Amino acid sequence: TVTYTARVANARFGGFSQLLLLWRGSIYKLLWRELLCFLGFYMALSAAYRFVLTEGQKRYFEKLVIYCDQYASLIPVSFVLGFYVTLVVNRWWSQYLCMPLPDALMCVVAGTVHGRDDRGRLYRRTLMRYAGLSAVLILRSVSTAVFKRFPTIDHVVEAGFMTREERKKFENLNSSYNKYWVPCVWFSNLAAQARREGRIRDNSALKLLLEELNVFRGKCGMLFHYDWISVPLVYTQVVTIALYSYFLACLIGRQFLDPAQGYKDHDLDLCVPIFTLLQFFFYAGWLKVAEQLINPFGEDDDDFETNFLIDRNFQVSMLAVDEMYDDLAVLEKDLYWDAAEARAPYTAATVFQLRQPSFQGSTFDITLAKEDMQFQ
Amino acid sequence: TVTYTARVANARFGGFSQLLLLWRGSIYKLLWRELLCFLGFYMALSAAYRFVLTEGQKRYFEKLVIYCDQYASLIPVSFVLGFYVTLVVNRWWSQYLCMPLPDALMCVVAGTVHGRDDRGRLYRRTLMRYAGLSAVLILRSVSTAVFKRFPTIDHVVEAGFMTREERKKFENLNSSYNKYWVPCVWFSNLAAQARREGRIRDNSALKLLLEELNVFRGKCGMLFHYDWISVPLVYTQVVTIALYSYFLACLIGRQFLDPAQGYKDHDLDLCVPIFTLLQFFFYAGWLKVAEQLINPFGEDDDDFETNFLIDRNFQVSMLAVDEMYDDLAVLEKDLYWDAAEARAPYTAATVFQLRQPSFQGSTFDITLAKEDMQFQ
Amino acid sequence: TVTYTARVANARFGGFSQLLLLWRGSIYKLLWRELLCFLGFYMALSAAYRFVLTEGQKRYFEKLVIYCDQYASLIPVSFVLGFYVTLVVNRWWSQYLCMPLPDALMCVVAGTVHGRDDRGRLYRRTLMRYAGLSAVLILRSVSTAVFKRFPTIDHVVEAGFMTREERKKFENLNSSYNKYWVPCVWFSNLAAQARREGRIRDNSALKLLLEELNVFRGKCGMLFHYDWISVPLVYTQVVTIALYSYFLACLIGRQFLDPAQGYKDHDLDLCVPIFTLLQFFFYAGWLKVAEQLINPFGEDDDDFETNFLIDRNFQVSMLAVDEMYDDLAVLEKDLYWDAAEARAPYTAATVFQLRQPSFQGSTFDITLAKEDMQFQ
Amino acid sequence: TVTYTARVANARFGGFSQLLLLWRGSIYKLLWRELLCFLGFYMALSAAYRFVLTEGQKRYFEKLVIYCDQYASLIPVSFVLGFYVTLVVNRWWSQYLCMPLPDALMCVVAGTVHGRDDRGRLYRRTLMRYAGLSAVLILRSVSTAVFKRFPTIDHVVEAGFMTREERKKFENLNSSYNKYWVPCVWFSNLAAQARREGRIRDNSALKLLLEELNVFRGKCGMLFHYDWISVPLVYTQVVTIALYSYFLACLIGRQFLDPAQGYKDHDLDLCVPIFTLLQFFFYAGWLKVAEQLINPFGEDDDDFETNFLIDRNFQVSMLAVDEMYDDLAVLEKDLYWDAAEARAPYTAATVFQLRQPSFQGSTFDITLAKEDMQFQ
Amino acid sequence: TVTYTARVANARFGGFSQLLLLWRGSIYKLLWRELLCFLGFYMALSAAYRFVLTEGQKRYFEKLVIYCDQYASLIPVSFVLGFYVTLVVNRWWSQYLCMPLPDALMCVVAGTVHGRDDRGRLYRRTLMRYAGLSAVLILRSVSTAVFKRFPTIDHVVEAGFMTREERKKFENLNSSYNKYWVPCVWFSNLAAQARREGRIRDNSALKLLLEELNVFRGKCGMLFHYDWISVPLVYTQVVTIALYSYFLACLIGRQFLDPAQGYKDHDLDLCVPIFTLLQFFFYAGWLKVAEQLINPFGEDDDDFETNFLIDRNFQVSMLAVDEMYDDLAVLEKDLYWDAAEARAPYTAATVFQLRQPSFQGSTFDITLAKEDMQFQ
Ligand SMILES: [Ca+2]
Ligand SMILES: [Ca+2]
Ligand SMILES: [Ca+2]
Ligand SMILES: [Ca+2]
Ligand SMILES: [Ca+2]
Ligand SMILES: [Cl-]
């Protein structure tokens, strides 16, 4: 993930031009090899035309270039790129939204699984660790970075997400399918046990716990579904073939022909196709957006930081359900206890935001006539 | 389903070019027959023009080719293809999301339907089998592969999803409509019976069971609705007619005319329309995306693996509610019990991900002046 | 509703060409009258130009045709058609999704409203009949076919959806607005009465009943809202005017001028504008998609089969809550009771689906080095 | 709101041409002044060119017209209009969906707030009046028509939505922000009181009431948010500037130049730009769609009938919770009590809908061979 | 936020032209510097061509201008701008919808946390202050204005959102990640304590409180996610590069060449490219829409008024849970108690809205024949 939100907080004169100077996760980094290859092919053709071909061969080459320039149709490429990249970007954001987060479960556990003793600590920590273990299993299934961090269930166990007895049961389960749901079933059974023991004080609390567990498990399954059901290969190949056909048409028909021959629209020999290179940059980077976002769980600069998410989720859930359980500050009157209204102060840099009228609605400036306001 | 997620984990220099070498679920496999037919018609016209037609007939043919080349308008067909294919692909993903999954129900059943004895096992297994049976009935109603696997209710019974007594009741039900909902009503009645017997310990647990059952049944009904309400036939015919009109215009107007006649834009005779074939590949494959995805329950390479889903769902649900019921490892202290913080180790291949700054928010680099930070 | 899902189960060489041979719900059926009118106007103009006009009048007509051919712009009409038709299609699918279905309510009623006696039967049947009656009232308010089937509340009463005493109360209610919600209020009161009498055994069951009732009533209200708030008339008129302007431009500028005059792009007299007719078919059918889908409750071939839905819903709900109440087969061990795993058999036509690798995730082929897998 | 759903129930030969004859909420009504102004400017320029300019001035004017006709690019304005109008239309429908409706609340209140006496009547009526009062306050904040109907809280009180003591408390509340949420807080407190008194018989019923109250209040707040956060002014100005630039380009470059000068594409002088006027109608009406829908709470013909909605909601909720409370017809056997199946009769106008095959699924015509149907 | 909803309440003849006269949040304010720079570059090139270049240099410059004018393709930039800006606008509205609002929580707290004494006041105020504190922490993490108002946790404490003891606990929490969730966990613990003490009278009320807390915390986390996961930098750079390439092509190829040279389409020398400047305004403002909306938490005129939202939320929640707790007006009969129907009066300005027919449905004008209405 390359974050530049602070750089674009305000619409400034520099604007996106300063973003054009960025390298990590950038179009230059994604596309310089392809640009070099395209330029190499173009320059090889140009050198052959200028120095190798005979006169008749050059005439035939000019005819071919003129013919091929007619098929540099950019409009269908723009259509298909726009639709395909929009679909890829929407799927990418949906995939991010499908990442399982333990915050709701940790709030529910801290509020419903009780006991300051070691047994209550064990219950809360084990439930949160089950959620984290399901997340780790699905993430090592779907993400290359997470798999590299946890290449084996031995690595998962030695990392602390799974214990040895839990690993024994996990391996003894007879299933040829991915077992990311097993810690969720463990969570359900443990919540039932805690309710039976009275650690969970009410059936409504148990129901809330199971509902949040099902939300978390559904997000894990959503990640699995996104990993399994790829964007249609036929669609991807169609867009790639369209872009490559346009690039071939440009590679042939954008050659600079001899101005002495007096061809229409061929009277300047720049020896470098600046605008063709810019168009290649535009379209190839437009496809590179989809190339980077199609699997957001790889190791691209703009891919999701799944290992950081794992670390943060586990640490935060453990803190919330162990260190912060029943650890409230004593109830005390707030600063605005005696004040009928309430408003925090403003700094010198933000006091200008005051004196802006408080929006009440858009209809409070009509100022009707007195005769009109009387009811029938 | 053709999965290439691993191949596109990272945006590499090879990129989608390597995907262009794939055959299963590919544009080549979907389109080579149509490409051959188009090339055959084009070459038949070319051979007739070159060898059969007289001089006057060739002059008339050249006039016709010039006239027909004017109507090879690619922009409108690009418009209609983009919109129609976007609709089809969104509907395809929605159809995948409407597939009934037993994971939520199996978690709820394992957590709420109690008893280690044979009666509790029977209750849990029968509830999960009812869910699986509803899924099987709707899938054999909507999917050709599932129907071929279960051509008869006799096949469904012999597969174990239905018992003989359940089949007797199912057949004795008097309805002229599809009976995929019958196992869901059975599930509801059985859950009520289990709550009455005390196997389900609370009304909240019963309510959660019925809510998850209704979600599952709603997904089954959504599959039925997608099977029934097709994409509008008028829309499909409109896009097909537009594409075929463009292809006819190209078939006539992309013929190579005699360069001796000196027609404008007709001075090169390649004898093979490379760019016309590439445009045909692009547009025909763009339509083939919708052709393959319009019914994702057929037997195309990119269609959903519904039989695999049935097997996985039944096996996993049976495991979760029978083998793993009340089968937790003994509660034990985790690896980070004494550690105030927590972080799993990193491998050599992933330790580079560390030292990346931990994102706290985009506003924590502003560095205001001292005078500005003072409250009013 | 015209269903062709089976015809497009697989992407085949025939593909959508076979769909082009369909008549019911087809572009030909929707558009042959308009095509005939367009061809008649074009042929009248052509005949006048060929046989009636003098030489000077023909010269002026040729100038007018050349002028008008410049305004046959395809991109703007394609744009507006694409956006408007996409909006109409999305709204049409949303309208289908807003159809009230009694399946969730019938499952809840079968699981929560108890009693094998006549009073329990009356309670369940009356609740489901109230849901069906609300559906019938809203459907006769919004659908021409349903209104033709139930032109009067007397027709509704003799149909069995409403009783005579219920009709007395319904008409004695003093409201100038549509009363489709009245059976939902009756449902709420009857559920409260059943809970008070102990037929509903728990407050959670009553809450679930009321939640599903509110979902059903919300769907009925959504149907009313879609019926009331039409697609903006200004938008519809804009798209119609754009299409008609393009068609007028074509009607004038696509006339075949005398080749003897030697006009640019006018040297062939086909006497039949094949490509203009194809473009008219394309655009007029594209608009006919929206014309058919704008009100999906009419009597078009692709409109929703609301009367069939009413019949199916009532029959299925009555079966579920009366015939199938507490009518379960005796709990018996399933076929895979002793089997640790489970997999239903495959037929000869589907056994090829086996031997396909079971997808575990996309990261399980990385095969890291031994040195890279060691934790820090 | 201009409703034409009945006119477009079926896709007929007349189709949208009949809609072209409508005046209320029409493009003609929205656009005739702008069309007149455009025609006046064009005619003033044409008259000056024909009768005022000298020969050299006419030559310069012809050069200017030819130059300006090059910039009448309709493609970009089509893009920007399509995207902007699609955004506006989607936002408009979302705004309609955000209108607070009391149907769910009235069903819950009639089912959960009990007592046939004056106190129970007071409880139910006061809860529904609180919901209606919140709706009225937000609607008079966001809608010009509702503000004109209720210009003052005195008008709101005298209309019956608020009492005098409630107004005393409402004005005694010290808040500089809009107080539409105050009746919702009153609703919450009153529901708590009713549960405490036993009028609400269960905590689950109280929870359902509070959930529906929160849904209603969320809809009110969403209306406030839509009123506050307008469509970006920069976006609106961009689309307006693009349309006006295109119209200026047309106003200059669509002038009819003297045919005697023999300019290319200038040889016919129609004295009236029919196609330019049609293009102006198309594009200006396309923008007028967004102009009308951007604030759907004004007084346009296609704006929402908010006062009608207020009247209907109040009347219907009052009926539902007061007149219809515990007023059910005696439970009686329905028409299909003894019938195993059920189907309402069909009229002569709809009996043709029968004999259509009952859809069972798309896979029930495969007709496999006997050999293929045997399990492995 | 710049609100102009009242200005566009109705579609008037002035319409968006009056909006074109606005300055705050306007395209002029966002774009005048870039317009000046573009005009300066164009005028520098024009002055060099007119006064500095020799004759041969001017001939080469004219050839270069003619060459570069061919690459001023507006269609690709139109596509990419439309798609990218649509994505940005949708994401911007989603970000606004992700703003945490305390209204649902305050209603639930006022209805469920009981006690008129100081302890009940403390409970309600502390719960709402915890919600407000979570909102403040996430907003100072994601919004530049909120960070400038609260540059330090010392500022947060001195503003009254956090107490000193709560600050001690907050800082003693050992976490390297953002702690916006800590007040939510405090809320959960305090709600559990209140239920244990009997201040919360039922487990259902506690569950509702925890559900609304989870919704609020989810919105806070969604704000964090939007702040972290920026719009892809590759996509932003692609659109910027495309726009800049088009602007460079225009800067070169829109130069006014000497009319004496008699170049095609170069015969008028206006010395000011009015239409090129209008196109620059159009496209640059279209991108400036995304530039302003990409981070809606900066300090642009159209950015969200987050400090105002903080003030309003805290003040309103404090009022609702402290001043308005158990402070209802005495239950009294409403104005329409004796009236079977109900309708509030209309003013003179709105009485015209009456006499509009009350919409009952679109099917109530069919008027079938007597023979057709008879049941079969
Ligand atoms: Ca901003
Ligand atoms: Ca990637
Ligand atoms: Ca298929
Ligand atoms: Ca219709
Ligand atoms: Ca309006
Ligand atoms: Cl609940």
Side-chain angles (χ1 to χ4, degrees), chain A residues 291-292 295-296 298 300 303, chain B residues 8-11:
Chain A
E291 297 193 30
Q292 179 168 237
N295 186 352
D300 295 327
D303 281 351
Chain B
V8 294
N10 300 311

Side-chain angles (χ1 to χ4, degrees), chain B residues 41-302:
Chain B
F41 288 116
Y42 183 99
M43 287 321 172
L45 276 169
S46 204
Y49 166 72
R50 292 165 187 274
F51 308 119
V52 183
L53 296 193
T54 70
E55 294 319 307
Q57 294 175 346
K58 284 170 91 295
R59 299 297 91 78
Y60 193 93
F61 184 92
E62 289 152 4
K63 286 186 174 61
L64 179 65
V65 164
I66 293 166
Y67 172 81
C68 290
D69 197 29
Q70 295 168 339
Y71 285 86
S73 50
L74 51 73
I75 308 180
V77 277
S78 303
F79 275 101
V80 75
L81 271 176
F83 284 112
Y84 176 85
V85 171
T86 298
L87 168 71
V88 169
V89 171
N90 289 330
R91 184 179 156 107
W92 165 84
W93 185 243
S94 293
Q95 276 182 270
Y96 184 77
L97 295 182
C98 289
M99 215 99 66
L101 307 178
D103 293 60
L105 270 173
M106 80 182 178
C107 285
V108 176
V109 167
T112 61
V113 185
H114 297 291
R116 305 201 82 150
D117 56 329
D118 277 4
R119 186 150 188 85
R121 291 188 60 200
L122 278 170
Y123 266 108
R124 293 189 291 276
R125 291 185 71 89
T126 306
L127 290 164
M128 285 327 302
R129 187 171 56 76
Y130 283 161
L133 177 58
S134 282
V136 165
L137 294 177
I138 191 56
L139 281 173
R140 73 185 292 278
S141 300
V142 309
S143 175
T144 59
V146 181
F147 179 79
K148 281 144 154 253
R149 183 180 183 188
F150 304 107
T152 75
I153 301 301
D154 287 6
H155 284 74
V156 178
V157 169
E158 216 216 346
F161 289 97
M162 203 175 246
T163 70
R164 298 241 154 61
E165 300 297 342
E166 284 167 7
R167 198 265 172 85
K168 293 190 190 293
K169 282 185 185 303
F170 183 88
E171 255 55 62
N172 290 343
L173 287 170
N174 258 29
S175 185
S176 55
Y177 314 99
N178 198 309
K179 296 172 175 186
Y180 70 90
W181 50 270
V182 166
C184 288
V185 177
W186 286 343
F187 189 112
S188 186
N189 280 279
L190 187 62
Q193 181 180 300
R195 174 70 190 109
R196 169 100 307 192
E197 292 189 0
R199 297 271 167 187
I200 300 170
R201 294 166 178 162
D202 51 294
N203 301 320
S204 90
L206 177 58
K207 183 172 187 283
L208 185 57
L209 258 182
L210 294 181
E211 286 165 359
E212 283 311 319
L213 172 68
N214 260 331
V215 169
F216 187 94
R217 179 215 49 73
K219 286 188 182 309
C220 293
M222 281 294 303
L223 280 190
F224 187 88
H225 295 326
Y226 273 114
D227 185 68
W228 188 29
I229 307 304
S230 304
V231 170
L233 175 61
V234 55
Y235 205 3
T236 298
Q237 289 179 326
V238 158
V239 305
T240 304
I241 285 164
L243 187 66
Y244 287 17
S245 297
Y246 177 79
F247 285 165
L248 178 66
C250 285
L251 193 69
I252 306 303
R254 301 293 169 77
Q255 293 292 324
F256 286 108
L257 304 184
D258 192 342
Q261 303 300 322
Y263 292 118
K264 191 71 208 153
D265 310 329
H266 297 83
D267 42 277
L268 192 61
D269 185 6
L270 297 182
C271 175
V272 166
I274 311 112
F275 285 107
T276 302
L277 288 179
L278 289 173
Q279 294 192 354
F280 177 89
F281 222 62
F282 174 29
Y283 286 142
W286 201 356
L287 187 56
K288 281 287 172 181
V289 175
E291 296 193 30
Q292 179 168 237
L293 299 195
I294 186 164
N295 186 352
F297 296 108
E299 264 142 349
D300 295 327
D301 290 333
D302 254 325

